[PDB]
Amino acid sequence: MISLIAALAVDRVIGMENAMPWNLPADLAWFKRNTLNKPVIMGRHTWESIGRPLPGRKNIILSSQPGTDDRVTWVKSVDEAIAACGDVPEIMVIGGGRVYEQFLPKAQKLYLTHIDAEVEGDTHFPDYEPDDWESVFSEFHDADAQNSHSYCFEILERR
Ligand SMILES: NC(=O)c1ccc[n+]([C@@H]2O[C@H](COP(=O)([O-])OP(=O)(O)OC[C@H]3O[C@@H](n4cnc5c(N)ncnc54)[C@H](OP(=O)(O)O)[C@@H]3O)[C@@H](O)[C@H]2O)c1
Ligand SMILES: Nc1nc(=O)c2nc(CNc3ccc(C(=O)N[C@@H](CCC(=O)O)C(=O)O)cc3)cnc2[nH]1
């Protein structure tokens, strides 16, 4: 099973040239909880902004170019990224935009965080059709002293 995890602002914005203008540690705890002990597949731009290997996960980085950090696994295509995951119950694709686009048609589950923030971004989560997906879990949270904006966690499973 392939899943995608992402945090989207309005208009499905997931990235901009500069750091996102929000602080959502609860969302990062959710990302950690849902990715721990699973392989995570990411694109090279996302690798760079994470800055280190994610602990307790097998880190697979897609890049057309030779790898530059022997602590993680580098692959040059989607089929190779999947093959590097081995025989696991769930592969987590953690972005970014170009990677989500390529894995969305393969995915059976989406873990999405919807952030009540309007930002201009250069990178979007792909268009998905609500009717293709069944919302199996959703949990809204208000902003609070640690989290700058309200946000809602949702898990969708492919119909
Ligand atoms: N809010 C969120 O949930 C979230 C999640 C993840 C990322 N992001 C954000 O999204 C942005 C990054 O998105 P992006 O679309 O720019 O970058 P990305 O998808 O992270 O990385 C793209 C790079 O990955 C490699 N790649 C992708 N598909 C490949 C394939 N089939 N074969 C070989 N290499 C492949 C290429 O690396 P080479 O260039 O080395 O060939 C390509 O330049 C940032 O702003 C980041 O912080 C947000
Ligand atoms: N829901 C969601 N929110 C995100 O911010 C997000 N970010 C990415 C890509 N970027 C990142 C950036 C940093 C970390 C990170 O540092 N995570 C740590 C800290 C978790 C915590 O603070 O509790 C980790 O161990 O997962 C992960 C992914 C992919 N999917 C996401 N999904």
Numbering used by the authors: 1 to 159
List sentences from the manuscript:
Dihydrofolate reductase (DHFR) is a key enzyme that is essential for the synthesis of purines, thymidylic acids and some amino acids. The M20 loop of ecDHFR can adopt three conformations (open, closed and occluded).
Hence, for the open conformation two independent molecules, A and B, existed in the asymmetric unit of the P21 crystal at lower pressures. Because little difference existed between the two molecules, only the B chain is discussed and presented in the figures. In the M20-open crystal, a crystal-to-crystal phase transition occurred between 270 and 500 MPa. Below 270 MPa, the nicotinamide moiety of NADP+ made van der Waals contacts with the pteridine moiety of FOL. The guanidinium moiety of Arg57 directly interacted with the carboxyl group of FOL between 0.1 and 660 MPa. The M20-open crystals contained (110, 107), (85, 88), 130, 137 and 134 water molecules at 0.1, 270, 500, 660 and 750 MPa, respectively (the pairs of values in parentheses indicate the numbers for the A and B chains in the asymmetric unit). The low number of water molecules in the M20-open crystal at 270 MPa may be related to the phase transition.
